[PDB]
Amino acid sequence: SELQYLGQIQHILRCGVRKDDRTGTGTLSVFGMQARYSLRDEFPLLTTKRVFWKGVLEELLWFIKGSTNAKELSSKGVKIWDANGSRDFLDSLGFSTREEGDLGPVYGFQWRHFGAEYRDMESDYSGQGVDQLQRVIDTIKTNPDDRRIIMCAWNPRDLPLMALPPCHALCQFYVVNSELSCQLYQRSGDMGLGVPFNIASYALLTYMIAHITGLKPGDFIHTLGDAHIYLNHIEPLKIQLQREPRPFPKLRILRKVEKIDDFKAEDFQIEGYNPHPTIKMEMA
Amino acid sequence: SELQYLGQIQHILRCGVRKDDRTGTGTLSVFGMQARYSLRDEFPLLTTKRVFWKGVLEELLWFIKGSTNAKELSSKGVKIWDANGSRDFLDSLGFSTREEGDLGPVYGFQWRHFGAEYRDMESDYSGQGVDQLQRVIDTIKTNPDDRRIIMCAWNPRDLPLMALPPCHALCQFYVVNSELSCQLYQRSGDMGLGVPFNIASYALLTYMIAHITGLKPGDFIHTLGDAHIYLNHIEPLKIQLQREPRPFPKLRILRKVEKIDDFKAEDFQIEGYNPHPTIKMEMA
Ligand SMILES: Nc1nc2[nH]cc(Cc3ccc(C(=O)Nc4ccccc4CC(=O)O)cc3)c2c(=O)[nH]1
Ligand SMILES: Nc1nc2[nH]cc(Cc3ccc(C(=O)Nc4ccccc4CC(=O)O)cc3)c2c(=O)[nH]1
Ligand SMILES: O=c1ccn([C@H]2C[C@H](O)[C@@H](COP(=O)(O)O)O2)c(=O)[nH]1
Ligand SMILES: O=c1ccn([C@H]2C[C@H](O)[C@@H](COP(=O)(O)O)O2)c(=O)[nH]1
Q1: Is A15 labeled as catalytic in the residue annotation?
Q2: How many domains does chain A have?
Q3: What are phi and psi of A192, to 5 degrees?
Q4: Residue B135: which domain range?
């Protein structure tokens, strides 16, 4: 339910502590939160504020492809990673000789080629590294009671090579009574900008994997480490905090897909999405 | 407070689902829980049941040394890893040519040498891999507002070489108002046997790091993925569930220590620990 996210926002606004951060902004921060969102006959796309669903779908397909090039996602119309891959930002991190748009070894590279030696974004890493995503799919297919169905994106060796280290760093899957659930550990949660996006992203991943493995989507457990509200997000969120939540939409997959790499953007349809208008919240 | 662990126990006994596991036993399972334990002027060593504190301290010192040899921990009187390091078990996982007691690349090897090529338990891995523990200590010392203070033991590349994959796979640290807090993500939680041990283990790690960096211990947030109670632990836990909890003890560090490697077992003293008698809960 969306009241969990709204309650987390209210709790950070009422009990969070003022804390500096890597960017010039400030935050109201709280350490350690957990919410639960049902995936049964509904999709947790927030209704108190319109969420960039096209960005969610395109960025998840971009993760599944193992791509770390921000230009490949920007060509689809999703510019969420163009800022963290811009020339000025890479220069601000010392990567002066790094090609523009190369985010380094990030979510997709760790999902599909964990442990492989990262060269650049144009390299072909076929057959290299550890393919975590296909491993969790096969584990769900052959041993659903396994307690190690984990995809981890935190790689300390590749950490100083990343433009932005993973925020949703680890996720675990769980199967019971033909229901597939997913828990996400998010080390850093931009409650206004990034967190609803990550909620929808991992709910979509759970739907995809449940479609492939013949299971029904269960719950999505969102665990947060440093859940923070930026200052330029205080007044916007309060606006969102005074809107009546509407029922969640539904996600329908239009064709039967066997492999996760064969999913395309046209295979997904959002039904009954009636959100309140968007609320601009600038990135840090 | 200890009532959080007891509440998780009660919630698993009343709402858990029957689930098979890797072992021959069964479990009452729940996916996704989170508890908060205060470290302010108290140490969360459970009082409704005596916890093997000597094992906690010696195992944390064994992790900090980067050791993967179970015999080095057994020589101190802690035989918790002898079962997963026995000849029959190593043979049950295919490691026929592996010396007995060699757990493979596990918690200590990932804490101190992430990414290094694992040879055996007798090898000297100085300078190899990524030293995550010292990196998080330096980060706490120089940049406490950092949101990337993470120590991760989940290595998919070294995963098929481990006798037992990490259960407490990832932890994150957080600093505010000169208070150091720690969150742990445990993918698999043996609620009867292992979870009380891991609570004290990570509380002690937080105390050590707070002592080194000159901070005060704050909270320990225990997040659980698959939190399960084994069947042969149902009736024992009920006994523990009807005991009146006593106040938590205190942890005192007897001398000023500069580096984490310089800690010794004689440096720590538990004060005021008056637990109820132990309750036998056999390992699976
Ligand atoms: N500080 C910081 N850096 C980040 N780097 C990467 C991220 C993740 C992320 C996730 C989602 C979006 C997003 O929905 N954008 C968008 C696009 C079109 C229209 C409206 C919006 C939202 C709005 O501006 O109202 C952007 C970024 C991120 C972050 O959240 N915070
Ligand atoms: N199923 C399963 N396998 C495991 N492998 C590793 C762990 C972690 C862990 C953590 C703590 C202890 C512990 O206090 N033990 C203890 C206490 C008193 C007397 C004898 C023993 C040892 C024993 O009874 O065997 C043992 C194990 C673990 C687990 O918890 N469950
Ligand atoms: O999927 C994502 C990507 C980014 N962020 C936000 C969290 C932080 O506000 C910022 C990352 O900054 P560091 O915490 O690494 O300093 O991006 C998210 O919430 N979700
Ligand atoms: O520190 C530890 C180590 C092990 N376990 C338990 C969790 C599981 O019940 C068992 C390992 O089996 P798998 O979950 O990996 O199948 O050990 C813990 O709770 N804590």
Answers
A1: no
A2: 1
A3: -80, -45
A4: 1-284
